Amino acid sequence: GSHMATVKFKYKGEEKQVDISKILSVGRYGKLIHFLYDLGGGKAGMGMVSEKDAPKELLQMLEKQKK
């Protein structure tokens, strides 16, 4: 099990959850926040949520991973 904090992302309406250790780089484009996350198997994934959908508590975490 992971001992890190997980971040929930509203992927096109779906509720996804990525561990903070899997988050590679987050890039806020303004209203839309895009992020790259490492999944496994050599390949990774990506997503983009809105400022309104992303909770402040998690949004601040995204600020720390803002690369």
């Binding site: 096109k12 839309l32 390949k43 990774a44 994934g45 990506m46 997503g47 983009m48």
Partner: peptide
């Protein structure tokens, strides 16, 4: 297999 894509109209 893994590797999704978004598509939001900015």
């Amino acid at each position: 297999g893994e590797g999704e894509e978004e598509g939001e109209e900015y």
